[PDB]
Design a protein around this ligand. Sequence first.
Ligand SMILES: [Mg+2]
Ligand SMILES: [Zn+2]
Ligand SMILES: [Zn+2]
Lengths: 99, 99, 1362, 50, 79, 277
Amino acid sequence: GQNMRVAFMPWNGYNFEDSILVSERVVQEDRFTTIHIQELACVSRDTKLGPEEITADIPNVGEAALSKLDESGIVYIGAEVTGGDILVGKVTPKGETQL
Amino acid sequence: HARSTGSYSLVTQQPLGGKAQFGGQRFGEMEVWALEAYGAAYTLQEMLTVKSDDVNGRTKMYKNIVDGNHQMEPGMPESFNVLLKEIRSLGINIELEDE
Amino acid sequence: EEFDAIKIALASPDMIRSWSFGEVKKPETINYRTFKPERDGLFCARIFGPVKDYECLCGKYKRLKHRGVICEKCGVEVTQTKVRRERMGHIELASPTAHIWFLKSLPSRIGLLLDMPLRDIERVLYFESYVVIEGGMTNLERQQILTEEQYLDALEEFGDEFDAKMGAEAIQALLKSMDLEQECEQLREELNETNSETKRKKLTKRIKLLEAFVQSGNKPEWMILTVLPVLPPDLRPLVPLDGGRFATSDLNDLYRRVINRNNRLKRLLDLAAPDIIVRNEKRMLQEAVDALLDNGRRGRAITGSNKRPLKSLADMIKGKQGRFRQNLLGKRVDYSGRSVITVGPYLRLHQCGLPKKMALELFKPFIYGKLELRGLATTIKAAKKMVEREEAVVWDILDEVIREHPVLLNRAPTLHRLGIQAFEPVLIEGKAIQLHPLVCAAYNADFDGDQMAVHVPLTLEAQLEARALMMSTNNILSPANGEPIIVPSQDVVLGLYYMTRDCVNAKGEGMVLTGPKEAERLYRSGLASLHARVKVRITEYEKDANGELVAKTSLKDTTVGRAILWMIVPKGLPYSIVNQALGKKAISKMLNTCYRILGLKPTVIFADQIMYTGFAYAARSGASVGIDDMVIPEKKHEIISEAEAEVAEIQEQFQSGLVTAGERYNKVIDIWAAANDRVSKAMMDNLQTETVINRDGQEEKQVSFNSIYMMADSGARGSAAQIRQLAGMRGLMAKPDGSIIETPITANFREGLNVLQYFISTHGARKGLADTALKTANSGYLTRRLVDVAQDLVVTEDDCGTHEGIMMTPVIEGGDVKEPLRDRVLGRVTAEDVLKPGTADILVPRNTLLHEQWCDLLEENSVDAVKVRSVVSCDTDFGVCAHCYGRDLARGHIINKGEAIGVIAAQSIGEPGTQLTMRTFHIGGAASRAAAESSIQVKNKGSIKLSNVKSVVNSSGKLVITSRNTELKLIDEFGRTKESYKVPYGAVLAKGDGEQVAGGETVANWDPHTMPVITEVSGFVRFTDMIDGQTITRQTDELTGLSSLVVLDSAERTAGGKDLRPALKIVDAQGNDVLIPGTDMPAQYFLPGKAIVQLEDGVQISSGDTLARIPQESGGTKDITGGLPRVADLFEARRPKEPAILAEISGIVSFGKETKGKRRLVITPVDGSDPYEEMIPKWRQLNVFEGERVERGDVISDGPEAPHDILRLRGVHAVTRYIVNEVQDVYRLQGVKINDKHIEVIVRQMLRKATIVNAGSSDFLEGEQVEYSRVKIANRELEANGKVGATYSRDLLGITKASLATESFISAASFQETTRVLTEAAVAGKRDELRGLKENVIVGRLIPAGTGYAYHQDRMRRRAAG
Amino acid sequence: DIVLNPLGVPSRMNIGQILETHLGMAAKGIGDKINAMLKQQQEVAKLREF
Amino acid sequence: ARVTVQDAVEKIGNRFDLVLVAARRARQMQVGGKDPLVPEENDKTTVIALREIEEGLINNQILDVRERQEQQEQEAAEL
Amino acid sequence: RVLDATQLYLGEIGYSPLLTAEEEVYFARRALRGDVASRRRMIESNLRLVVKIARRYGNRGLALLDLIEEGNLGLIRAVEKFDPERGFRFSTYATWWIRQTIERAIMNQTRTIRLPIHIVKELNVYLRTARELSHKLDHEPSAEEIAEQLDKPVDDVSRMLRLNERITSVDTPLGGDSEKALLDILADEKENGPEDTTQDDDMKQSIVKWLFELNAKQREVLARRFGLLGYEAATLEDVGREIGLTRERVRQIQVEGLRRLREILQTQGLNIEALFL
DNA sequence: CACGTATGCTATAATGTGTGCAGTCTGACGCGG
DNA sequence: CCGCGTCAGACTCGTAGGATTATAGCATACGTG
RNA sequence: GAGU
Ligand SMILES: [Mg+2]
Ligand SMILES: [Zn+2]
Ligand SMILES: [Zn+2]
């Protein structure tokens, strides 16, 4: 962890039941800031109808979305992503449906 | 984590659990008794029916909420139906004698 | 859709066929390639319906264009796929099979009905032996088992005319042919011959079975299955996982076994196979069916490759994982979220911080609806995409919707109702929920990582329920005790303490200030301290006789701090309330006072205000914790050195072989306990009042201005016990067993413990921590049982119109009025006035709620005891009236009809246990009891008044007590009771009865460690049944020759000395017995186990000499782990191990005969002249001495009272008060306030049922047990119609059995014991009309209580008028 | 940098945190003295003595 | 009204029936678009109903009266 | 007493006397003739053989009792097809039938999803081949390595190995902890969403409103032909026959009504375009 | 006819199982000898 | 009585997916495009 | 593993 300058005193109930009041300075210096490496997988399986494809050719996709995806349909190294962004494009053979 | 409406469980029909599966919280027996103590009848019934199994009730309630009218249209939880069927599979005749 | 009731009855083979829509003849689930259901298989779509909505299998018929069409090609009906979960199938079994539930689940049912032992049935079933179904030749009777060779003998001899068969067929046939009517009459005729006690029970059981069997319309044939039902596909799903894998229910595997075995049996029959193979297959079939229904019941559960037993049908209904508990009494719920919680000091009481992101999701549909009214969103899909993009206009809309909309915050475990409270959400940027400080108490929420759940009340009704019933502002008071639960804590208390507390002169002593505004100005200018003593002009509003307020200006003497707090104080309240130094305990009273005078709204505002100023001043103070505050006492080393030498003295006495190991262990504990107290006292005195260094005039003194002491004295945090371990002494640690270690921890925390002190600490610490994790389950289980049994109790009526009620007296345990008559009776309805001419002329009329007003008048008048209307004594059937309950403690006024009181009661009783099981479980590592029960020192002057005492004057001239129920009172001038104390057996008194005593005078003195056995007569000691090795042992020493006689118990005794009772017989010089004064009782005192004897046989004694000393190891730990099992033993109505004996009926006591010491009693009343006899064990000594006028339920023996016997002899008020007091003893010892009325609720539920002894005009008759409500309603109709009246007697039931005894089998089954409950109900043909709350919640209906009471009574009037 | 509530000490009986804080402050005090001396650049000798 | 419901409870009495009464009134405003007595002052339907009850305008029995009055006039119109 | 199925059955078989060769031949001559008693005695005398063989084949297929019954069925086939005249012993002949029947039973019943014999036996040769490969490669073999050995398609090998994927129970609790099973996580994918159900209401109802905007004639033609407000999707001839003879005119009014809806959409389609996700 | 699924037969003698784990918990409440 | 059996044993949260084996070889038989 |  990280050592720091602490004072023991109440403060307007912001440290009520063990609660902690911390200075913006600690956040600015990013010393408690942490790194997390998460792992997302796209599987292309073979179904009864036929194989799933990992193409960039997907129904209903914006150019904005496909910009960060290469020809294969895979996001580029270095790319910043946010919830909802497509990482690996994949498509599945859909059967009949009574419209 | 938070959820309004999402996937539901297979046989019991009540919402699934856990944040990774986009689940609802459990309102357990303990939690039910709280509401009973207070006497909050509709809130209770709400959590038993429109918020959980009651299939036609949940959809009807959702439509009503989007149309403003906060009307309760409650029915019977599907898990109860299941229970009867499980008892009949046991070879015990358990019938509802209606009014 | 909506039904009235639910019936369970036996499933006929024919009935099973009715539900079925196809016979499943194949194990094939689906095809390997086209994963479509296989023909006549377990998932057959021809049987159970179409896989896809309005599509046949082969795809010939598609859409609604073909509605009810049945495809000729494939054979599938074209409908909703929905039906696959609804439609059942069936299997035709070649050989009949027993239903395991109606076989193995006891009572046997099938065995009970045939009166055939279970083993016997089984030998028949598994084809070990034949059974005779009808031996026409009376030579061979019915149901008589024959072995294989036994069947061969009578085969040639009788043959033909006797039919005896083997297996399920035989038993089914035997069942079919039994005529229940006839045999019922036959058995009833035999019941009249000589009905022995146990015989009459078993016979009455079969009688009730046969009666109920005919009433149900069930037939015994149906116990045997020929048709086996098949559960719908979707309730045993076969689904493909994403990865191409398949996952199925275990039921499908079990069914595949059954089908395979049954179909092989059909094959073996077609092939006409030899009978041994037919037998094996029939057993095989039964095995598979039994596994299907209930796997690990009969024998080895059939296991998967994982080793784990397959989950059968019954496992899905049974236990926690079962449908009831898991998916029906509790559910996963939409519009719910959860997060980490943190403080919101800035929040007002009715608010909470709700993360924007969370609220955006929770209120999704309301946002869409509003978006369409604004015309911002064209369609629902567009609104969805608009909220995904999280547009700035959507934030404003969300803000619009959340206004005035309550959300529910919940924290687990939800012990009482306040664990869920409603708030107005305040949207905040950031992911944690912010909780208001004052309600932290109710949630038990501390922010060390706690999390909370959020729920959205959706409907206008639910929103209103939340705002009105569940809002934090509205629910202040604990429903358990009438105390405000929202009480400032921690920093808030600390700050208020800091402002109100006074210091010597300080800045600006004796200033004169205009109003508290001038005070605030001066303080913040820095010309006065908060603790400066000062004169201040305050205008205090005193509320008049009516609502009008009268104000009055006064110059008071207070600090600057107190004046400033007066600004937060509302007008109406007095200044003297704040004029004292404030702490947590005073602030709770403050809030209460404000609630009672002003009301809700003022108190709510005042509470917030107090919170703000509390924290505010807390911070300013600059209060901190450094190593120097932990002041040590110079007399620390000194005290310890002395204590060690004192312990060493007893250790040297032990090596000498004089003092025992137990005696030394006790004395060492007492030395260290006394030293620990003195060191604590020295630390507190050296820290409490150390501020001698004053000023102003000259050297004055004041209270210590420490940071620690202040924290503890204010009640913010810490206590004297804690500071002992910081500065003083750690104390005596306790082992995980409960016993205390001989060496305590002498050191403390500031000084630092060594390796061994630390190690020694660990044991006790860990024991405590484990107790948190492990014992809370048992606490919580208690909560659950209570709740289940009180469920049904609701306020049904306003006034029952009863005159009945319990007479509450005063309690004075030790000295302080633990439960003054005022605190015990407040907010109860007075059943009956008490006219004592008096000082304030008080009648207080009937049916008056005791307001604080009338209670204060009672104190002035000195009321002794009062009849108060009670839940138990209510006449309302199917609930209680508002009057018999009284105040809803959580509201502070009379309870509203409709309120579900039972649930409240059980929660309130259960919670503390459950919470205290976690608390003193980690807040302390150490044990602190008090073995100071040495003597009794009176506090105030008065005259001594002994009641129920029986002592005898000794040689030393001391009134030695020989009574067990001895008690000492302290009567004042007017003849009023005040102080009392339990004086034990063999205690030495100071002064006789009545004698006067001054203050601080020792009137009693005894030795706790040891229960001496003092005599009554003088003479010589004679040994009877005191053989060495048989009952006693021999223990001597060296030189002269001393020896100690110890009494072994059956535990350490021999088969020979088992019936031998050791005693010390008293004789004179001539060798003749000495009778007890004024009786024909030879003085013979029976020694119990482990009894020690110093002086051996042949020794002269005088009246008052101790014969023996019974050692007494009570490790009383204690805390709660010990208490709650006592409480549970009470609520479950378990009879104590050695119960006292009571007189049954009033009359004159007559002693009779003795069987080798076993006492018979030939008792003869006055009116009922016929004698009544009762056998008593030999060693059990009676406290009374015969020949007496005895009321019903006078205590003969020493021992604990069984609640059953109390009810049976002294009626309901007696047992009710016994349980209430005995329970309250536990909780009182742990400092838990619970109102008696809650325990009274439970008691009443326990007294639901009554056994009828003598026939009525109905079909009650002898020995049936029915609900007391129903039989009293019957008696109202009997009164009207005359006819034969029904004589009954009320019975007490433990909580578990009382819940199982309710007429509702859904409630019973859902509770526990589900397999048995269901067999019972199915056979009885029982119907539940759904009265209780449990029942309704299971079916997802509207509760019959609270909000729902209105709707439910409307439905009920619809039911009554057709 | 952080303000902790002192009311979470006496109940808890974890005094290690307080000792840690005092020693911590002394540790940092010496650090600041060394830091001050390094900024001034007194000399190797003087740093070594201290 | 808004925070604390105490004076509203004092008017009606039974908390539970207060909830029913206010819900029925709020449903009228929500669905029927029935006219509020007290100025909304930008408050929600639920709050409007509770204010009305506090001041003693709405009552279970009064609601029943206006229900029959208007229903009877509707039947008169039909005939 | 002694309530094990197995023990009881084994005791019963024990109490039948073992046959010699000459006895078997005499009995069996009469058994083929149809002696009944002879057949019964030969079966019962040779049950012990069945149990010895089922003991071997058990292991992991099925319950011992299950194997014993199937084995008995094989033994019965053997008694029906025995040749007494041929010098070969009965036990030798029966062993073949008993092993055969047990194996065939365990090829069918063992698998939850019933696998045809051909597929099963194919799969088994893939397995045995894999074993030889693994011994010599040191490594367990890939799908394509097994395929190269058989000189066959990799798709064939892959499909077979997919079928060998053995089942997981939905009820099996997850994570070595008796907390919650697969069922507790597993969604119903088909069942949308009060969202989705309410969206269909909204959709269907918006279409009603849109249909009424059009002419009475167009709306009725559309309703009857689509099967929207009508019951059945009435063909051109049906709609024309009920209204206006001209079958061609139904097509004309229908297509006209669609184009008027396009106009409403270009004007007020601002709501309709958002139905595209 | 072919393709997918099934039913079938094979002849030295061999003729009563075991096998893989369970680990022992606890205070209470009934049920045949 | 003794002994053997059955029944209960807090509430929410979490993490992560996953295991095993083997059934011969060939000729005729039944159902679908 | 997180509060009880
Ligand atoms: Mg906590
Ligand atoms: Zn079809
Ligand atoms: Zn009453």
